[PDB]
Design a protein around this ligand. Structure first.
Ligand SMILES: NC(=O)C1=CN([C@@H]2O[C@H](COP(=O)(O)OP(=O)(O)OC[C@H]3O[C@@H](n4cnc5c(N)ncnc54)[C@H](O)[C@@H]3O)[C@@H](O)[C@H]2O)C=CC1
Ligand SMILES: NC(=O)C1=CN([C@@H]2O[C@H](COP(=O)(O)OP(=O)(O)OC[C@H]3O[C@@H](n4cnc5c(N)ncnc54)[C@H](O)[C@@H]3O)[C@@H](O)[C@H]2O)C=CC1
Lengths: 482, 482, 482, 482
């Protein structure tokens, strides 16, 4: 039911052309709601990926010579086409990933914003004129594109993560070759159709599908891949960083987080409950910024949990294309197993399930939104990310205790807390060890802000004025003989 | 013969205290000129290094809470003490490394400049106030110290590389634990004496000596080491990056380069010869920015080589503390063997040794400055770094040919060319694939410029306004409930 | 012959509504080619302007509260509408001002670029987070809109000067009330129609026509006018600055210049002649950046003047809407009188008219493009701006002599020189006393560059990242009690 | 009683030499405590000032050619000499102006900080490399010194205002000629002695004394004066801006303010009283940032006024060189008359004097610190600046009412308020119409912050990264022929 059926394609985008696997191999794409088959995308080997990388290298050589105005115009055309076809893209995203159609459309728009922002940033790549060491010399600092970039995106955001990687790379003058997740490769191919329609030159943007490990090896071992941007799990990031060591490749990583959610006694309780609802249960808890631990002060915990239960009662599961549906199915059975393991550990270690705690009657990978009280810091959920709709509530008594507990983790992606006092807000926001802190709000996604984490959560930033730094290399030129 | 004998020490600096190895093990330091023994520094194991890292962590916790003015004042005091004791530091450096005393003093001053610059930068770590997405929210971007940093420095610059790593780390509010090269550990310990005298708090600066591999493993595997800065060979950098993968550690690497030196027919020949003399033969060719290939256009090559031979005839070898001595001994016998191998390959492959080509009559590790004509692109020196005073001269005919030849390498550290036309200068400087380009000058060292390389030559920059970026982490704070 | 006849209007834009003079008074607009009447715009008194300023104040209060995204979207819509209707706008501009239709269209597009650039800049108004003086205090630096801005534009660019004033003002969140030149008020009103169509809120943009002096007095004496941007002659700028003194109003002025054009013996002669043709004879010499003195070295002067005469022979006068017409009529008879006076002074003082030197056979205000050799520094044209198509050629012998002669003026707007040597280019470009220097090019208009002059040529800049600074005020907030 | 008697001088500093008036005319300097004569400084006419301006022009020509490192080193030497001689400078300042010796020393140190900061900024004057419009052109933006600057300083801070004007001017490469207030010219001459001792070249720094109006006329009418920085009253600023109009001179003005002081019901009352004590009664209320109106919410006013009276009881008047003295005499009898007029208007219009209200028993220009309750918005003090130690207390009931009352003034220099809620702090700080806002603190002086006002309080900023912008001019260079 697509207004533009060309946005659904069964071929990979290599050297600006639509190709299939030369051995006929393919990977099926299935709808998570009922397992229905969608299409067979090509399964590309290492040789086709090598040819794609060579094409991307030539295209990058031709693409860095264009003016910043031309590249910005191409990126703006791509953004306009993405916003124009947002309904078809949202339908494809909901079909492949399973999130509610409203969430899919919100993702498409709020992440085409990244393409718009970096189209603006393409014209602001400014060098420097540094004072010289003597009268006979001047100093220029030029910023130049690093080269061919390789992007690896997860199933978590089939469209959202692609724009925030392709935008800065293209704006800087770099070429991109993207390997999307095999579970949800259709959003990438639709964006490739739009990019070709937008005037992106042949080879500058490429989407390759296939077995993840061989393509990652080709990305890590090809000398013509200057930079690799990766979003995904911590283990695959560590594997990539180990494999890219032999070539000294620039690596930008966004890995998992364990986001605390603190509610102080001087907070707005209704605002705190709304923020917890949007931070935890968005994408059915499958978001890298999703809250994973909810800390409440002892004097407020009862009222917070009462309002939270009242709000969780209103959640409705079902198919994403169904009106009134807030929660879609988990990505696969492993997510259900992990969520069950976390709930079982919570129950055994002393916690109490207040709501949910079992698979929903819909069957498949659907799960009831679970609210559990009495969680402690020894529990599995206290140190591990569920990626599923579970709301563990830990109680505290003092600000420094919750600061000690919230930083008791190796992941530094996101954190949230609710308070009114300015001194407390500044103190807690500076003390929390995270890349991003949301104060009195559960929504932090922004193409103008430096999205990214610290510690094991990865390196580099996405969006803002710092998002293009990783794709550029400095060149210090000393002009003598004046 | 030291004005301040306390600048020569036989102990490592751990937790702000002077300690020795608890097992009595030690590493001897010898003078490269005649093998004379200087002192026995401690050989520290992994447990002492672990305790040092813990102390550095506590010190960093206390040191990031100080105001930027206090940290800048401490760094400025350290710079003042370094400049005041420049003669003793230069004598220690010449004794341990072998470079001429004038070069040692120049190194000490021109690299204390880094400490001064980053003392100034400590007070300019500014956040951002980004426009909000709606009236109810504001956006702050804070910059915070990454944590405990570990520095590994080579024998190449026993003092120079330490200031440009300790300055930005301390200015950002990070703590440093440094492992200097075992060949030349005395400059680091002298700087540690001065740092303690300058008011650096206990644990903020640490110097540890011992076997390189166990300390590097401890640096890579300790969770309390947030960042690792390394300067050295490409192989050790690759080993470090592979070993740091399991912890997702921020890695800044300055690795080797293969610097071309181009002389066009529209160049100032006397200036070109002076630039080649300072770029190639400084530190007896043992510099990461030293020229390694000298390209000359066909119509200028004869006059350039005649003037170059006239200038090389004036070079004088001997002990560093001897007046009129321009060249000191190579670091060890491996450097002599590599230089001999390069000369032999040049002779066998068709090249002609015009001057030098053998060890000097002084014996030991001294080598005659060698000028060889007829070098080609298949020669070992054309793709490998000698780190020794050899001047290979390759001839070309056209600008694009020399651009193809100069970029025919995996190392992107430095490059030099001599030309007068503005269009040619801009075109060649933009086409050359290097981190740093010196136009009409063989001297590019500058604490105000972004020192660093591209491709395999490493990641990150030293000095300038970009030198402190690697030691800071961004924190995006979204302040809701307005 | 307008595709959209609503772009031609006979009413002023006040409080977001189209109004006429309440006393029936009006100002006629006539076509400079043959004096044909176009329309009668209102002649507004000081009371109507006062009401307009009050409306602009209320609108600014409502308009600074909108998000930067909304204001950028409005500005981008305005830019899109301007580019879409570029042909009708160009026809109106050619009818009112007289420039060739191709030049009018080029003006419309290349100055809507300013609106696009400042729409991008609207989202990049970033504050600062400065390190505090102690642990108990933080420092924010906010940037806020200055308030209601008043713009005064000349007949020189009926459309070009309006976008580069309205863009930054609206992007910053300021409101604008513009008084265009009485000779060419129709382009401003057409842009007002488009702005209303683009969603600019009522009062944020206002166009008022009438007697210049009373409206300027109202602008200078109204306390609700925070800032005044003026483009025009030096005398009116001095009058405005004297009249705005009593209120301490922020004043940005772009006044006249006396642009030198130097041709060195190492220059590209064909490029120099093309640059002189575009710099001097564009807009029939009626441009603030137009070359006014052409200096040539003694060894190149003959060939330069021969090629220049060959190129001037190809100029064709006539109506702007006529194919092949390069030169339109001067604005009025005063321009013809001034050009005749300059030619007469040149002839009497020793110079020789090589080409032109009299009114063309077309009659009216048309003038033959004049090339005069033998000009000296005592001549009237050497120190005064003709604003008419005369090419005075002064010869020199040395670089320092031409540097002394080119800086022998109180105006610092623009300068041009042609040379190839990098050292000479840097030296002369740094020595020339001008806001803008065009090296080897006669075209410098750019919305990404800081357009503006020094000395008597005015204060402030237009375009680039510095163009929005004048419309914002800093606010240093010190947050204590941490 | 000076450790260095050369810091007290009776001559003006012109062309780097110490001169007297060629007609023997002089101006006496008297101690405000008892009228005791100190020294006779020269009274310089317009011809000597013209010669000084010519010398400053030549010196600026020689001084902009020095490297940024050399100028920064000179400025740092000047700062070091100022801090070393802080006691003699403080004694001179207390003798000439009358403020307590502790305040004089604090002024000397905290304003030599400006010299240090701008010495650091001298090396950070960076140009830009903007992306070109096509492949054949590049764009540089250079920052160059504006030229010769003229500074006019008040008696308010005999030393404080001089460093924050001379630092940025010298760092940018501009020359300064300063005319200090005739009441307190000795601090300027002492700083000139130190500047000569610090290696400031002849003519770069000049101090001229004499009749204010002729020297101001010479500053405004000399074509070689590029920029004028003025600190003082609004009327003299308006006169200067009117007189500088004929030459289109860059004018930076810091004029008077009417600073509100708001205490909300959610504030820390002890902190509010301490902040009011330091903001109001510092320099006996003779400060441009001194609080002038104290607003208190109705529910807190009684306790605030009780604590304020308890703190005002502890103030001690007398000679500045006396231990335990907090308040010195007013500058002259006009200040006493104005303070008496304000107190009389407060008493007549309904207000009640709670403490003080008359001249102290010490006689002369001493005045008792006065606290008056019941002040309204019609009172003279509500719209006029006393510059004397009077604490008018106005009561309010709601936040928007106090926002309306605080902005009910044409002066936008400083404001203070005390609150704890983050939303209230952000809202009020953004709503207040002032250049500087001090939240929960009465101290805002900082060389790293943009000191300056809005509206009639003046234009431009002092300190921070924006303090050097006014002394530099942009130069857009377009390099064609690539
Ligand atoms: N924080 C984040 O952004 C993400 C977190 N996750 C984490 O991952 C778990 C499940 O997701 P996964 O499928 O494991 O994610 P993943 O990290 O394995 O998948 C992300 C991307 O990596 C690629 N990839 C996987 N193995 C690879 C290999 N050996 N070589 C090269 N590329 C390879 C995949 O094709 C995909 O494009 C979740 O429970 C959560 O912990 C899930 C998705 C993204
Ligand atoms: N470009 C540069 O900055 C440098 C280049 N070189 C290269 O290295 C060659 C000889 O120098 P090398 O002694 O090989 O340099 P290197 O890279 O091995 O030594 C640099 C530092 O690395 C440390 N290190 C060495 N092995 C380590 C290990 N396994 N784990 C942890 N740390 C370790 C050393 O203690 C020293 O502090 C030269 O021929 C040249 O190619 C030499 C010195 C520095």
């Amino acid at each position: 039911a697509l207004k533009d059926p060309a946005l659904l394609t069964d071929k990979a985008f290599v050297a600006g052309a639509w190709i299939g696997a030369p051995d006929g191999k393919s990977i099926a794409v299935t709808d998570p709601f009922d397992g229905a088959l969608i299409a067979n995308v090509p399964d590309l080997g290492q040789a086709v990926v090598a040819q794609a990388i060579d094409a991307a290298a030539e295209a990058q050589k031709l693409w860095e010579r264009r003016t910043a105005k031309e590249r910005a115009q191409v990126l703006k055309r791509w953004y306009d086409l993405i916003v124009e076809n947002a309904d078809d893209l949202a339908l494809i995203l909901t079909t492949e990933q399973g999130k509610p159609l409203a969430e899919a459309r919100g993702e498409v728009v709020s992440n085409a914003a990244y393409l718009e922002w970096f189209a603006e940033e393409a014209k602001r790549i400014d060098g420097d004129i540094i004072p010289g060491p003597n009268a006979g010399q001047r100093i220029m600092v030029l910023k130049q594109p690093v080269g061919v970039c390789a992007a690896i995106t997860p199933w978590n955001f089939p469209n959202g993560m692609i724009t925030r990687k392709a935008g800065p790379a293209l704006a800087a003058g770099c070429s991109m070759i993207l390997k999307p997740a095999s579970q949800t490769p259709l959003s990438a191919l639709a964006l490739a159709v739009l990019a070709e329609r937008a005037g992106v030159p042949k080879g500058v943007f490429s989407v390759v599908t296939g077995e993840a490990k061989p393509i990652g090896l080709e990305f890590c071992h090809n000398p013509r891949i200057a930079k690799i941007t990766f979003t995904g799990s911590t283990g695959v990031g560590r594997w990539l960083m180990k494999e890219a060591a032999g070539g000294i490749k620039r690596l930008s990583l966004e890995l998992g987080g364990n986001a605390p959610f603190i509610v102080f006694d001087d907070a707005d309780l209704d605002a705190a409950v709304e923020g917890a609802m949007i931070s935890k249960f968005r994408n059915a808890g499958q978001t890298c910024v999703c809250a994973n631990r909810i800390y409440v002060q002892e004097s407020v915990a009862a009222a917070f949990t009462e309002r939270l239960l009242a709000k969780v009662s209103g959640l409705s599961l079902g198919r994403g294309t169904d009106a009134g549906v807030s929660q879609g199915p988990l990505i696969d059975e492993k997510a259900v197993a992990k969520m069950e393991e976390h709930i079982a550990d919570a129950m055994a270690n002393g916690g109490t399930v207040l709501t949910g705690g079992k698979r929903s009657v819909l069957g498949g990978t659907f799960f009831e939104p679970t609210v559990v009280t009495g969680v402690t810091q020894t529990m599995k959920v206290a140190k591990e990310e569920t990626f599923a709709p579970l709301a563990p509530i830990i109680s505290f008594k003092h600000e420094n205790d919750v600061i000690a507990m919230a930083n008791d983790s190796e992941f530094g992606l996101a954190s949230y807390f609710y308070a009114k006092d300015m001194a407390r807000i500044w103190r807690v926001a500076e003390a929390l060890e995270a890349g991003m802190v949301g104060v009195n709000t559960g929504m932090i996604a922004n193409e103008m802000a430096p999205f990214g984490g610290i510690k094991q959560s990865g390196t580099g930033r996405e969006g803002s004025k710092y998002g293009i730094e990783g794709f550029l290399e400095l060149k210090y030129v000393a002009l003598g003989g004046m």
